Amino acid sequence: MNNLHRELAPISEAAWKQIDDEARDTFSLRAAGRRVVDVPEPAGPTLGSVSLGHLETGSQTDGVQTSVYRVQPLVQVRVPFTVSRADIDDVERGAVDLTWDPVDDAVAKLVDTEDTAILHGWEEAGITGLSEASVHQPVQMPAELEQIDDAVSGACNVLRLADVEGPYDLVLPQQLYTQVSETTDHGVPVVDHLTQLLSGGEVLWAPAARCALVVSRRGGDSCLFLGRDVSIGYLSHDAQTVTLYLEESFTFRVHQPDAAVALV
Amino acid sequence: MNNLHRELAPISEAAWKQIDDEARDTFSLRAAGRRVVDVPEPAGPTLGSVSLGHLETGSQTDGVQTSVYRVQPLVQVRVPFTVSRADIDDVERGAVDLTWDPVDDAVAKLVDTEDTAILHGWEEAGITGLSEASVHQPVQMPAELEQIDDAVSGACNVLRLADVEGPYDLVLPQQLYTQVSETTDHGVPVVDHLTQLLSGGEVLWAPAARCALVVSRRGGDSCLFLGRDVSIGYLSHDAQTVTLYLEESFTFRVHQPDAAVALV
Amino acid sequence: MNNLHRELAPISEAAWKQIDDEARDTFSLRAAGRRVVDVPEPAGPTLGSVSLGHLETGSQTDGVQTSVYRVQPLVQVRVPFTVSRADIDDVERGAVDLTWDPVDDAVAKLVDTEDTAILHGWEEAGITGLSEASVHQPVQMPAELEQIDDAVSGACNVLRLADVEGPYDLVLPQQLYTQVSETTDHGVPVVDHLTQLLSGGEVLWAPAARCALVVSRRGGDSCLFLGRDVSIGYLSHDAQTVTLYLEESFTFRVHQPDAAVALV
């Protein structure tokens, strides 16, 4: 057994397969910050920090000179939720109409916190997001949404002058995504022009985002370091419900501040 | 070239071989803390921290619970020294009577700082030594040095009651080593009785030590983590001298506080 | 599953390996009565008594004569202790600085009770120890510890006159072991003379002993019968701690009372 005490849970194998598939599908559909950043393979549970590559010189006495390496520790996130033993039992009885609402809510919370850390920064785990770690001034957005191409072109040209280059992605909040998708100009959808401006990039639907922003996709400008990965574990159970949790250990770091620009 | 800009130094190959051999021999003879602790293979220049394996829980809001891994960063030490171009030139002319006094002094400084960090702790790099990270009260030492066996037996029995076990080593300052070696009781050297008490261990000569202490040698109680290793590098040169430095990146950590006891 | 409900404990496999290794190492180092007696292989959980080989004649009526075999039942010992779920979780996170103090304390209790049963007898499980089941009068010990050779020689000669023979072992309490090890006569350690007197035997450090005693090592004079063996099992767990226990089923019996003598 690992730290995920899964064989100690009163949950059958089919119910486990349904539960860890609903959560994974919800995470894959709901998470948009994972797409804009580079995500390497999970290091493992032993890894606990990322070396920044720099040294802080504190003090130096006589011949001896002393300097300390600079590192950023990882942060773990646990979101607990309760599921129904009646549903878990019906899973083998053949129910296919089970909506794992607690699982979806927990995945939503995890996705929200991870996307907020990636895009704006957590400022509690020491993470600085793309929006905060951006040297470019925010590019204003025109009203009525028929002229969003102006802001997109301005952002792309700011990135080009920053020698950033590469296919760009425009990440929008869900409401702005709705409005831009419904906007049509003179009967010609603005999304086609936006895709043409993005040099082959895509407009992304980010339900957990809180601001619009353009990022290059050349590669190597930001990275999400995962020690562990999104996993489901067991906490306790009573005669009515079973308590589980979603756990993830990670950090996020921005190597090149100029590869992203904020369209606020 | 690496960060040790050695091909940019006005030093011949025979002079390099003499210089990096004098320093290595002086370090091997002078360093005694390396013998009492476990030293794994050097990790490399990229490694910058050691994960303690623990988590600090700072705060937790709504469903999300947040905890941060605990790590200890490495520390680098650089000791510069100047050598004579006349000596470097005489090295190929055939001089074998060259005493690299600056090199010996720099190695002495490096050995002193490393041994102090290992045994008493640096309290500047975050290192806690064996003496400070000891849960056992200090075992007093009798006077006149004929009864040092009493203190040795008391320390060994304290370690045995702590379930520590294993061949013990008694590390002494150089002066106390002289006095114990010259002490003879009733014509029978006390060193033989001390070795018998130590369960096959050895009495160690530590010129850089500042206190006497007994450590078990079972293995796994303390560890010195080396990112880089003791290396010689180049800084500058003028028409008279060449400036070099000794560099080492390391940390020290005590896993089991009870395996060592302080005989002060 | 056996009666040790180990798969029902919220403990990982690495934590199990650390827990059942700390206890075993502590038992091996701390237990000294196991060394002085013969310990055969564990019989099993079904065995419940040892047949003494004798018969008690209670009554006999008319032609029929009735006698009952004499047996000694085994006794089981359970020592419970609580361990921390935080430590168990850190075991996979990489902590190597975990001191299993509850486990050490439980092993100490088990070792103390077993050694007391072996040497002095439990008088609750029906066990009579070597000290109580000794036909030899106690051999007095001289003061100042420089003349302990006198008591050792007297004990060895009493055993020789009892036709016992064989390499003898002198079992001492921990305090007396310290004092004898530090005693040196005229600069010549008394331990060498004691070993010479013991006919190649060893002086044993017994932290759980309460009296000094010499036993022959010829073989077959006393025996510790183990049905089960020192094992770790699960009791319960809450959100903070996990409750485990150390269990052992045994008995001790003295075949030849004259092979041991008490130096009190």
**How is A99-168 classified by DSSP, letter by letter?**
--HHHHHHHHHHHHHHHHHHHT--SSSS---TTTS--SPPPP--STTTTHHHHHHHHHHHHHHTT--S-E
Distance CA A146, CA A225 (A): 38
CA-angle at C105, arms to C102 and C106, nearest 5°: 85
Residue of chain A minimizing CA distance to B79 = A64
Distance CA C198, CA B229 (A): 52
Whether chain A has a CB inside 8 Å of the CB on C7: the answer is: yes
Write the CB contacts of C122 (distance below 8 Å, at least 6 apart in sequence): C75, C113, C116, C129
Residue C14: name the closest of A45, A2, A6 by CA: A2
Going along C167-208, which residue ranges are E strands? 168-173, 203-206
A233 and A50 in contact (C-beta within 8 Å)?
Answer: no
Residue B157: name the closest of B203, B212, B199 by CA: B199
Under the phi-then-psi rule, with left for phi > 0, alpha for psi from -120 to 50, and beta for the rest, what region is A114?
alpha
Q: Which residues of C touch A236 (CB under 8 A)?
A: 239
Q: B167-182 burial, b for 16+ CB within 10 Å, e for fewer? A: ebbbbbbeebbeebee
Residue A163: name the closest of A257, A88, A94, A81 by CA: A257
Residue B152: name the closest of B183, B114, B111 by CA: B183
Q: C96-129 burial, b for 16+ CB within 10 Å, e for fewer? A: ebbbbebbbebbbebbbbbbbbbbbbbeebebbb
CA-angle at C94, arms to A220 and A49, nearest 5°: 25
Q: Which residues of C touch A2 (CB under 8 A)?
A: 12-13, 92
Residue matched to tokens 């009870």? B258
The single-letter DSSP state of residue A85 is H
Q: Which residues of C touch A238 (CB under 8 A)?
A: none
Residue A44: name the closest of A252, A251, A249 by CA: A249
Could you say which of C7, C92, C239 has the minimum Cβ distance to residue A3? C92
Q: Which two tokens stand for residue C247?
A: 């269990």
Distance CA B81, CA B86 (A): 16
Name the β-bridge partners of C251. C225
Could you say which of A49, A65, A75 has the minimum Cβ distance to residue B49? A49
Whether chain A has a CB inside 8 Å of the CB on B253: the answer is: no
Distance CA B30, CA C217 (A): 48
* Parallel/antiparallel/unpaired status of strands B49-61 and A203-206: unpaired
Could you say which of A49, A55, A67 has the minimum Cβ distance to residue B71? A49
Q: Is C13 close to A1, i.e. CB distance below 8 A?
A: yes
SS3 at position C261 = strand
Q: Which residues of A touch B79 (CB under 8 A)?
A: 63-65
Q: Which two tokens stand for residue A106?
A: 């927990």
Distance CA A99, CA A104 (A): 9
Could you say which of B58, B64, B249 has the minimum Cβ distance to residue A109? B64
Write the CB contacts of B1 (distance below 8 Å, at least 6 apart in sequence): B7, B8
| Beta-carbon-side half-sphere exposure of residue B260 (alpha carbons within 13 Å) | 29
Residue matched to tokens 């990270």? B133
Q: Phi/psi of residue C65, each to 5°?
A: -115, 130
Residue C208 parent element (H or E): none
Write the CB contacts of C11 (distance below 8 Å, at least 6 apart in sequence): A1, C19, C88, C242
Q: Which chains touch A (3 or more CB pairs under 8 A)?
A: B, C
Q: Which two tokens stand for residue A118?
A: 């990636």
Name the β-bridge partners of B169. B215
Residue B255: name the closest of B212, B210, B214, B225 by CA: B225
Q: Is B68 close to A106, i.e. CB distance below 8 A?
A: no
The single-letter DSSP state of residue A83 is E
Q: Which residues of B touch A102 (CB under 8 A)?
A: none
Rounded to a whole number, what is the distance in Å from the CA of C151 to chain B's nearest CA?
23
Write the CB contacts of A60 (distance below 8 Å, at least 6 apart in sequence): A66
Q: Is C10 close to A7, i.e. CB distance below 8 A?
A: no
Residue B194 parent element (H or E): helix B190-197
B204 and B214 in contact (C-beta within 8 Å)?
Answer: no
The single-letter DSSP state of residue A257 is G
Q: Which two tokens stand for residue B171?
A: 């590390």
Could you say which of C8, C93, C239 has the minimum Cβ distance to residue A45? C93
B243 and B135 in contact (C-beta within 8 Å)?
Answer: no
B101 and B83 in contact (C-beta within 8 Å)?
Answer: no
> Which of residues 99 through 128 in chain B touch C, CB cutoff 8 A?
none
Residue B134: name the closest of B261, B264, B263 by CA: B261
Q: Which two tokens stand for residue A251?
A: 């950090």
Going along chain B, which residue ranges are E strands? 49-61, 64-73, 75-84, 168-173, 203-206, 213-216, 222-226, 231-237, 241-254, 260-262
Residue matched to tokens 């090592």? C217
Residue A215: name the closest of A199, A226, A231 by CA: A199
* Residue count (chain C): 264
Residue matched to tokens 């646990």? A78
Distance CA B173, CA B143 (A): 16
Distance CA C34, CA C208 (A): 12
Residue C90: name the closest of A227, A77, B69, B60 by CA: B69
Cα B3 off chain centre by: 24
Q: Is A46 close to B49, i.e. CB distance below 8 A?
A: no
A90 and A98 in contact (C-beta within 8 Å)?
Answer: yes
* Parallel/antiparallel/unpaired status of strands B168-173 and B64-73: unpaired
Write the CB contacts of A88 (distance below 8 Å, at least 6 apart in sequence): A10, A11, A12, A15, A242
Q: Which chains touch B (3 or more CB pairs under 8 A)?
A: A, C
Q: Which two tokens stand for residue C192?
A: 């060498």
Helices (H), C37-173: 85-93, 101-119, 148-161
Other residues' Cβ atoms within 10 Å of the Cβ of residue C221: 21
Residue A245 parent element (H or E): strand A241-254
* Parallel/antiparallel/unpaired status of strands A231-237 and A168-173: unpaired
Q: Using what technique was this structure determined?
A: cryo-EM
Q: Which residues of A touch B249 (CB under 8 A)?
A: 69
The structural domains of chain A, with segments of one domain joined by +, span: 1-130+217-254, 131-216+255-264
Residue B196 parent element (H or E): helix B190-197
Residue of chain C minimizing CA distance to A1 = C12
Residue matched to tokens 């890894």? A47
- Chosen for mutation from C6, C18, C92 (greatest number of chain A CBs closer than 10 Å) is C92
Could you say which of C10, C11, C94 has the minimum Cβ distance to residue A46? C94
Q: Is B75 close to A62, i.e. CB distance below 8 A?
A: no
Write the CB contacts of C93 (distance below 8 Å, at least 6 apart in sequence): A45, A46, A48, B51, B53, B54, B55
SS (H, E, C) A164-230: CCCCEEEEEEHHHHHHHHHCCCCCCCHHHHHHHHCCCCCEEEECCCCCCEEEECCCCCEEEEECCCC
Q: Is A45 close to C12, i.e. CB distance below 8 A?
A: no
Could you say which of B67, B68, B80 has the minimum Cβ distance to residue A63? B80
Q: Is C8 close to A3, i.e. CB distance below 8 A?
A: no
Going along chain C, which residue ranges are E strands? 49-61, 64-73, 75-84, 168-173, 203-206, 213-216, 222-226, 231-237, 241-254, 260-262
B171 and B213 in contact (C-beta within 8 Å)?
Answer: yes
Other residues' Cβ atoms within 10 Å of the Cβ of residue B239: 6
